[PDB]
Amino acid sequence: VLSEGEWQLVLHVWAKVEADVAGHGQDILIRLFKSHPETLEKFDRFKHLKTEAEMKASEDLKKHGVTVLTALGAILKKKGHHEAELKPLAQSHATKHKIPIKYLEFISEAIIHVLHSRHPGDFGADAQGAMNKALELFRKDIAAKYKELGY
Numbered sequence: 001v002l003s004e005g006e007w008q009l010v011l012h013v014w015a016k017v018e019a020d021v022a023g024h025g026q027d028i029l030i031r032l033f034k035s036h037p038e039t040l041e042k043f044d045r046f047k048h049l050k051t052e053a054e055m056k057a058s059e060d061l062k063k064h065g066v067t068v069l070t071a072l073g074a075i076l077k078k079k080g081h082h083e084a085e086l087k088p089l090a091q092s093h094a095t096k097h098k099i100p101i102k103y104l105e106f107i108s109e110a111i112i113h114v115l116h117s118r119h120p121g122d123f124g125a126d127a128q129g130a131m132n133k134a135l136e137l138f139r140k141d142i143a144a145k146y147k148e149l150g151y
């Protein structure tokens with residue numbers, strides 16, 4: 001459980017993300033696919049983009065960066081009272097996209113990496129720990145929905 005103070009660190013960082021949501025999202029997807037190439041295979045739409053240079057050039061990941069980060073932002077803004085926002089996403093990722101929890105761990109590493117890269121002097125130890133606690137709660141809660149569904 002996060003404190004209100006930690007939630008405020010999380011949401012203050014999120015406002016930075018929102019100043020360039022497509023670029024942050026593109027960067028996170030590139031990191032995910034470059035660091036864990038098996039993840040790219042889950043995306044039939046994007047799996048032609050096998051090099052970092054192709055990924056970075058693609059209008060596809062800029063647009064998709066908005067999709068993923070807007071959804072994550074909406075969940076973060078619920079400060080863990082996020083069951084309703086989280087549920088449809090868990091369902092879609094278990095059944096339709098078939099995404100293991102390990103892959104959500106991979107994208108969580110990519111999020112922290114990019115936040116650090118893009119905000120080197122304004123994403124410190126406290127903000128990074130708080131964001132890690134928020135992402136852990138997100139993953140825990142998706143894992144609980146996965147268990148309920150039998151995925």
Ligand code: HEM
Pocket residue numbers: 039040042043044045067068069071072089092093097099103104107
């Ligand atoms: C922060 C974690 C994530 C968030 C917030 C998120 C959110 C979303 C959203 C909002 C959509 C569009 C609606 C839908 O089809 O459900 C989506 C689609 C999808 N997600 Fe995720 N996702 C996350 C992580 C992942 C990961 C780690 C993978 C795979 C390694 C993945 C695979 C997919 C796939 C394959 C689609 C369909 C993409 C398309 O063809 O349009 N997601 N996700």
